[PDB]
Design an enzyme around this catalytic site. Structure first.
Site, PDB file in Angstrom:
ATOM      1  N   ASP A 186       0.900  -1.147   0.000  1.00 11.06           N
ATOM      2  CA  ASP A 186       0.000   0.000   0.000  1.00 11.06           C
ATOM      3  C   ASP A 186       0.934   1.190   0.000  1.00 11.06           C
ATOM      4  O   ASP A 186       1.557   1.485   1.018  1.00 11.06           O
ATOM      5  CB  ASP A 186      -0.909  -0.003   1.226  1.00 11.06           C
ATOM      6  CG  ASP A 186      -1.729   1.258   1.342  1.00 11.06           C
ATOM      7  OD1 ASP A 186      -1.680   2.088   0.417  1.00 11.06           O
ATOM      8  OD2 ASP A 186      -2.469   1.405   2.337  1.00 11.06           O
ATOM      9  N   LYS A 203       3.342  11.518  -3.539  1.00 12.87           N
ATOM     10  CA  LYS A 203       2.233  11.019  -4.331  1.00 12.87           C
ATOM     11  C   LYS A 203       1.384  12.138  -4.939  1.00 12.87           C
ATOM     12  O   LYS A 203       0.753  11.928  -5.987  1.00 12.87           O
ATOM     13  CB  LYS A 203       1.415  10.084  -3.421  1.00 12.87           C
ATOM     14  CG  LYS A 203       0.343   9.221  -4.071  1.00 12.87           C
ATOM     15  CD  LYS A 203      -0.075   8.130  -3.103  1.00 12.87           C
ATOM     16  CE  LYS A 203      -1.284   7.356  -3.547  1.00 12.87           C
ATOM     17  NZ  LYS A 203      -1.651   6.395  -2.460  1.00 12.87           N
ATOM     18  N   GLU A 219      -6.780   1.010  -4.907  1.00 10.95           N
ATOM     19  CA  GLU A 219      -6.811   0.831  -3.446  1.00 10.95           C
ATOM     20  C   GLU A 219      -8.140   0.380  -2.859  1.00 10.95           C
ATOM     21  O   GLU A 219      -8.101  -0.419  -1.909  1.00 10.95           O
ATOM     22  CB  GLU A 219      -6.333   2.086  -2.698  1.00 10.95           C
ATOM     23  CG  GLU A 219      -4.820   2.370  -2.722  1.00 10.95           C
ATOM     24  CD  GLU A 219      -4.442   3.847  -2.484  1.00 10.95           C
ATOM     25  OE1 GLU A 219      -5.336   4.705  -2.199  1.00 10.95           O
ATOM     26  OE2 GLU A 219      -3.206   4.091  -2.414  1.00 10.95           O
ATOM     27  N   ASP A 266     -12.827   5.195   2.120  1.00 12.41           N
ATOM     28  CA  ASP A 266     -11.381   5.371   2.280  1.00 12.41           C
ATOM     29  C   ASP A 266     -11.053   6.859   2.365  1.00 12.41           C
ATOM     30  O   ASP A 266     -11.155   7.593   1.376  1.00 12.41           O
ATOM     31  CB  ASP A 266     -10.569   4.693   1.172  1.00 12.41           C
ATOM     32  CG  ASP A 266      -9.027   4.732   1.438  1.00 12.41           C
ATOM     33  OD1 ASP A 266      -8.561   5.485   2.310  1.00 12.41           O
ATOM     34  OD2 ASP A 266      -8.255   4.005   0.787  1.00 12.41           O
TER      35      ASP A 266
HETATM   36  N1  LIG Z   1      -5.722   8.199  15.185  1.00  4.53           N
HETATM   37  C1  LIG Z   1      -6.081   9.052  14.204  1.00  4.53           C
HETATM   38  N2  LIG Z   1      -7.238   9.692  14.390  1.00  4.53           N
HETATM   39  C2  LIG Z   1      -7.586  10.494  13.368  1.00  4.53           C
HETATM   40  N3  LIG Z   1      -6.856  10.823  12.283  1.00  4.53           N
HETATM   41  C3  LIG Z   1      -5.704  10.134  12.159  1.00  4.53           C
HETATM   42  C4  LIG Z   1      -5.293   9.219  13.071  1.00  4.53           C
HETATM   43  N4  LIG Z   1      -4.159   8.537  12.720  1.00  4.53           N
HETATM   44  C5  LIG Z   1      -3.921   9.034  11.495  1.00  4.53           C
HETATM   45  N5  LIG Z   1      -4.772  10.100  11.167  1.00  4.53           N
HETATM   46  C6  LIG Z   1      -4.697  10.921   9.966  1.00  4.53           C
HETATM   47  O1  LIG Z   1      -4.766  10.028   8.837  1.00  4.53           O
HETATM   48  C7  LIG Z   1      -3.927  10.460   7.734  1.00  4.53           C
HETATM   49  C8  LIG Z   1      -3.112   9.267   7.138  1.00  4.53           C
HETATM   50  O2  LIG Z   1      -3.970   8.265   6.572  1.00  4.53           O
HETATM   51  P1  LIG Z   1      -3.293   7.030   5.818  1.00  4.53           P
HETATM   52  O3  LIG Z   1      -2.021   6.680   6.512  1.00  4.53           O
HETATM   53  O4  LIG Z   1      -4.314   5.991   5.709  1.00  4.53           O
HETATM   54  O5  LIG Z   1      -3.113   7.829   4.497  1.00  4.53           O
HETATM   55  P2  LIG Z   1      -2.476   7.225   3.221  1.00  4.53           P
HETATM   56  O6  LIG Z   1      -2.980   5.874   2.876  1.00  4.53           O
HETATM   57  O7  LIG Z   1      -0.996   7.356   3.254  1.00  4.53           O
HETATM   58  O8  LIG Z   1      -3.129   8.335   2.313  1.00  4.53           O
HETATM   59  P3  LIG Z   1      -3.658   8.028   0.870  1.00  4.53           P
HETATM   60  O9  LIG Z   1      -4.636   6.937   0.996  1.00  4.53           O
HETATM   61  O10 LIG Z   1      -4.245   9.216   0.215  1.00  4.53           O
HETATM   62  O11 LIG Z   1      -2.554   7.546  -0.010  1.00  4.53           O
HETATM   63  C9  LIG Z   1      -2.935  11.488   8.340  1.00  4.53           C
HETATM   64  O12 LIG Z   1      -2.988  12.741   7.627  1.00  4.53           O
HETATM   65  C10 LIG Z   1      -3.343  11.645   9.813  1.00  4.53           C
HETATM   66  O13 LIG Z   1      -3.380  13.018  10.244  1.00  4.53           O
HETATM   67 MG   LIG Z   2      -4.474   5.139   1.784  1.00  2.00          MG
END
Ligand SMILES: Nc1ncnc2c1ncn2[C@@H]1O[C@H](COP(=O)(O)OP(=O)(O)OP(=O)(O)O)[C@@H](O)[C@H]1O
Ligand SMILES: [Mg+2]
Length: 603
Positions: free
Chosen positions: A7, A69, A170, A193
């Protein structure tokens, strides 16, 4: 070797693998099941990746790259990239070809060389656990990615020394992680998502027949500008307004302070998903002529919810569209899946649950479902997982009806998806003002023997002789398998379009019948195309003369339907002697006999 699932996220990345029958999310060298999508180049010449890079971003803002990204596969002059150029603390430059690149310590680097550093760590994470080399991967991408973004993600994989065996959307990956080991029975799921970089919504059908599970997308969309980043920047603006009000200083002009403030705001947002109040505490946040200044601001969950409620309520209207496009009510959705770290916010979970009326499933991990599904797809390719069917090819040829009731193929059967093909057609009759794009599925040459997937009209065509207008018809099948049909009048610019549901589709029983039926009828269908091609070069020329007067003319109307080439070819020679013995500001004259190879459309 093994084919691992990655991912590749805006904020976080995750690597997973099939362990015989059950997937396992792997801890990186730091003991973490996810890795920040951050790459940093330090002053002493080292390359840090993941949490080591995250920890030093604030002290090394120019040379720590994050959120790549948003740039990978995009052109430097895209507005989204230009907005991005100003706000990002690292240097975004135009490559010689106009692509958006980044620059660190004088070295110009392409976004894929940067994302490859996360993938080299992901490959290494898996190789340490397995004790052998890894060279093959399935990598995920957001559903809104276009062709160029998909190519650039694959390019990143090649630079990391991984052969990218498959790219899968995804949300589709998330459904695969859930669909192994599911409580039996056909179910409809909604995959919600909300990650750091974007929102994406999918309606996915998971069916079960003879032990084999198939996965089919009924609708998909989202909002590409709502993500955990936008939650942060609502909190960031509040702290700026509060600090301006409390101490008369606008921090927006202090780059050092704003980098500290964005990280403090994100940790506060996260903390307020678990607690009811929190304190943002930043000593030496700035300075003016009167000495150092300090920020200490209380933020309650009620206040936070107030700042971002508008973003969540705007995420609901895209779900309704997805349901309209899937032809379903909320009541037909049997399960909801939350994906993405930003869904851990209680207001998000509550707001989503309120729409569907059911509680989201609690056994799907929002930070890990996508990587696991990527691992699942890798296991299908190695043959290690057998109760999974993903159709990556068109089951049947797709095309449109053209003059004479003929099926004209635009995309051939068994073409790899995603794919896109266009062909230019024209009008069949003099002064025709519109054409009916009639979309068809099947292998037969008679349009009436194939399945109608839908139809639409394109209007506003200028009166002109047959074959002179130019109508471009485009078939686009996206990676998630949904067919978009568009028709464009090239000389005026007008466009009309449709999307065609899976339900208006043909089933495996029916697919196998269409194939068996057509081979047995191969010579008969060839004969129909042959007696059409001449039937229509002939009604070509009595339309041409009924309009020319303003006679065996009723005897060739007979001998067009009499299914014989030389029977029409005689009523040609017959009214070709009833005719052989007895230039302004608009379209052009004939003056000679040539015609063109462009196929014709009724309307
Ligand atoms: N415990 C939490 N409660 C609420 N928000 C959170 C928490 N933990 C992470 N986040 C938020 O979630 C976001 C990250 O999500 P994730 O890691 O799933 O994104 P990603 O998969 O990298 O993003 P994308 O899917 O667009 O590629 C961050 O910007 C963060 O501020
Ligand atoms: Mg993601």
């Amino acid at each position: 070797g093994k084919i691992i699932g990655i991912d590749l996220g805006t904020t976080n990345s995750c690597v997973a693998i099939m362990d015989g029958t059950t997937p396992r999310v792997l801890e990186n060298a730091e003991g973490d099941r996810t890795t920040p999508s951050i790459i940093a180049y330090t002053q002493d010449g080292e390359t840090l990746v993941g949490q080591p890079a995250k920890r030093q971003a604030v002290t090394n803002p120019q040379n720590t790259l994050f959120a790549i990204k948003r740039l990978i596969g995009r052109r430097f002059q895209d507005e989204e990239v230009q907005r991005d150029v100003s706000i990002m603390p690292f240097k975004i430059i135009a490559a010689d070809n106009g692509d958006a690149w980044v620059e660190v310590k004088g070295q110009k680097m392409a976004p894929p060389q940067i994302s490859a550093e996360v993938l080299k760590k992901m490959k290494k994470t898996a190789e340490d656990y397995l004790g052998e080399p890894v060279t093959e991967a399935v990598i995920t991408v957001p559903a809104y990615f276009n062709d160029a973004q998909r190519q650039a993600t694959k390019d990143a994989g090649r630079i990391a020394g991984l052969e990218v065996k498959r790219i899968i959307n995804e949300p589709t990956a998330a459904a695969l992680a859930y669909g192994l080991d599911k409580g039996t029975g056909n179910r409809t799921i909604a995959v919600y998502d909300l990650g750091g970089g974007a929102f994406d919504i999918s309606i996915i059908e998971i069916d079960e027949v003879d032990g084999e599970k198939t996965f089919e997308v009924l609708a998909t969309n989202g909002d590409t500008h709502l993500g955990g980043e936008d939650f942060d920047s609502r909190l960031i603006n509040y702290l700026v307004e509060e600090f301006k009000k409390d101490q008369g200083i606008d921090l927006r002009n202090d780059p050092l302070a704003m980098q500290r403030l964005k990280e403090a705001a994100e940790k506060a947002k996260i903390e307020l998903s678990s607690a009811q109040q929190t304190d943002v505490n930043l000593p030496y946040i700035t300075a003016d002529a009167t000495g150092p200044k300090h920020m200490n601001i209380k933020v309650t969950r009620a206040k936070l919810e107030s700042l971002v409620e508008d973003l969540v309520n705007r995420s609901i209207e895209p779900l309704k569209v997805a349901l309209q496009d899937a032809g379903l009510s909320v009541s037909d959705i049997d399960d909801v899946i939350l994906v993405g770290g930003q869904t851990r916010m209680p207001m998000v979970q509550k707001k989503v649950a309120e729409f569907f009326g059911k509680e989201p499933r609690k056994d799907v991990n929002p930070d890990e479902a996508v990587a696991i599904g990527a691992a699942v797809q890798g296991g299908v390719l190695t043959g290690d997982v057998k109760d999974v069917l993903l159709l990556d090819v068109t089951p049947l040829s797709l095309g449109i009806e053209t003059m004479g009731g003929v099926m004209t193929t635009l995309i051939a059967k068994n073409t790899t998806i995603p794919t896109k093909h266009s062909q230019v057609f024209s009008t069949a009759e003099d002064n025709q003002s519109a054409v009916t794009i009639h979309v068809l599925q099947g292998e037969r040459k008679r349009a009436a023997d194939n399945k109608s997937l839908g139809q639409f009209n394109l209007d506003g065509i200028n009166p002109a002789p047959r074959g002179m207008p130019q109508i471009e018809v485009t078939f686009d099948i996206d990676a998630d398998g949904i067919l978009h049909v568009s028709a464009k009048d090239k000389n005026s610019g007008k466009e009309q379009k449709i999307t065609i549901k899976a339900s208006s589709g043909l089933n495996e029983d029916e697919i196998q019948k269409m194939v068996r039926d057509a081979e047995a009828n191969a010579e008969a269908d060839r004969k129909f195309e042959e007696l059409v091609q001449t039937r229509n070069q002939g009604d070509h020329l009595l339309h041409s003369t009924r309009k020319q007067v303003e006679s065996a003319l009723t005897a060739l109307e007979t001998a067009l339907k009499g299914e014989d080439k030389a029977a029409i070819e005689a009523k040609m020679q017959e009214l070709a002697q009833v005719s052989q013995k007895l230039q302004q500001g608009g379209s052009a004259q004939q003056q000679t006999t040539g015609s063109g190879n462009r196929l014709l459309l009724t309307g």
